[PDB]
Amino acid sequence: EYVNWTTFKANGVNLGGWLVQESTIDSQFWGTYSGGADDEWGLCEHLGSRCGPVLEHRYATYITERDIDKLASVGVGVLRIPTTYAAWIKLPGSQLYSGNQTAYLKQIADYAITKYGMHIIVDVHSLPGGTNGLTIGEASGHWGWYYNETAFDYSMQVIDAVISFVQNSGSPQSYTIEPMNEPTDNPDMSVFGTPAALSDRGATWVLKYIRAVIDRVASVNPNIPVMFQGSFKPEQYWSNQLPADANLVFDVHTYYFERNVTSETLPARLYADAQSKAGDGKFPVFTGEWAIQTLYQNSFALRERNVNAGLDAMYKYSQGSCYWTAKFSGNATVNGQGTQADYWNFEYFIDHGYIDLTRF
Numbered sequence: 001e002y003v004n005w006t007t008f009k010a011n012g013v014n015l016g017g018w019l020v021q022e023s024t025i026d027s028q029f030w031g032t033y034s035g036g037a038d039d040e041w042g043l044c045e046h047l048g049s050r051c052g053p054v055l056e057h058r059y060a061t062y063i064t065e066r067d068i069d070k071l072a073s074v075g076v077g078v079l080r081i082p083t084t085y086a087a088w089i090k091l092p093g094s095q096l097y098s099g100n101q102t103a104y105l106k107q108i109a110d111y112a113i114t115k116y117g118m119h120i121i122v123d124v125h126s127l128p129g130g131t132n133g134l135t136i137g138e139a140s141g142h143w144g145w146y147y148n149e150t151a152f153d154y155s156m157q158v159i160d161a162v163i164s165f166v167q168n169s170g171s172p173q174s175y176t177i178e179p180m181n182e183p184t185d186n187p188d189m190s191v192f193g194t195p196a197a198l199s200d201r202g203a204t205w206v207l208k209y210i211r212a213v214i215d216r217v218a219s220v221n222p223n224i225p226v227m228f229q230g231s232f233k234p235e236q237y238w239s240n241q242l243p244a245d246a247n248l249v250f251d252v253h254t255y256y257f258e259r260n261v262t263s264e265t266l267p268a269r270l271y272a273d274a275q276s277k278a279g280d281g282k283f284p285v286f287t288g289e290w291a292i293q294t295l296y297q298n299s300f301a302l303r304e305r306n307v308n309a310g311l312d313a314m315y316k317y318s319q320g321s322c323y324w325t326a327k328f329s330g331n332a333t334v335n336g337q338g339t340q341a342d343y344w345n346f347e348y349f350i351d352h353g354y355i356d357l358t359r360f
């Protein structure tokens, strides 16, 4: 059956650091191969002709079917899989690597679908020209996507390629298409993650894009849902700019590592945030990214209580959540106990008995 996000709910993880590279998720990989760069773009340019071979090895090893087995053993029902635009098109001028990403995407997705019945969110994290000035949007310092007709044309070709992948998957009812991630045009980094990170001028271009995508997907298969990561606005900001019959679910992201909160007081914040992001009911809401690290006083002991309290909150007020991220080994210190790898690594929660998603 095709998924209807006004009734469907699921709990799962992101597969971060696998087909999109980021410095924080694997400290050992980034130290060895980045050459000092802070984005995937610069890591790849630094490696030159060796970029492909290195990344192809990572695609084959960082996430495998054994990792999927471990996720299923606790009842994970949804995988959010970030990809770069370079997995889908070969953009002239780009320093991101265009290789066999979709071959690994299919092997892993087919397995999670066939063996365990999981749903797959295919996330196009970056778009040609850059959507947010950050590595995840294309490259550090790139905001060239906005108002750029050439970049717009290439972006729709990206979506055409995702549509075909879903249509020829053998199970198109298993996929949700997410055509962008965290678009922002505000250069002040202290306002990232907040509504002011996207101007109204930039929002008109985002709306142009998301309506073009809604129409293009529906023209091929009106049953494939579209997931709109509407930057850091509330769903109510977008809901009256879109026809009610769009097959549309909103993806909101909720983090706490730069907010004045402690591990002790985190559950109150998790419940408040899920309540305020529940939306107006014209379209449903999914919490596609979250994590339990707080800015202050991080506590090993409270990890089990806090991750389970987040799962509770996002399932009660919304359609569920995907943790960031499945596997994480970055060793940056945090305030209080430990490093980020003690709080962003979903595998540790599974391995130490914190997770039983069948209780929902």
Ligand SMILES: *[C@@H]1O[C@H](CO)[C@@H](O)[C@H](O)[C@H]1NC(C)=O
Pocket: 004, 005, 006, 222, 223, 247
């Ligand atoms: C999803 O369910 C809602 C509520 O019944 C309905 O209005 C909507 O048309 C359904 N989606 C599709 C694609 O039929």
Ligand SMILES: *[C@@H]1O[C@H](CO)[C@@H](O)[C@H](O)[C@H]1NC(C)=O
Pocket: 027, 028, 031, 331
């Ligand atoms: C973090 O991990 C990297 C990779 O193993 C290592 O080179 C570095 O020394 C570590 N940093 C700290 C502060 O432990």
Ligand SMILES: *[C@@H]1O[C@H](CO)[C@@H](O)[C@H](O)[C@H]1NC(C)=O
Pocket: 056, 099, 100, 103
């Ligand atoms: C990518 O996949 C194709 C199709 O199997 C294969 O022929 C090619 O050698 C692969 N390239 C790399 C770099 O693995």
Ligand SMILES: *[C@@H]1O[C@H](CO)[C@@H](O)[C@H](O)[C@H]1NC(C)=O
Pocket: 091, 092, 093, 128, 129, 143, 144, 145, 148, 150, 151, 154
């Ligand atoms: C427009 O987008 C293209 C495609 O990525 C990019 O190469 C170019 O630099 C962009 N132009 C501007 C002015 O940002």
Ligand SMILES: *[C@@H]1O[C@H](CO)[C@@H](O)[C@H](O)[C@H]1NC(C)=O
Pocket: 260
């Ligand atoms: C964070 O909050 C605590 C109490 O909630 C307050 O004492 C502290 O000053 C705040 N931090 C900053 C930087 O204002």
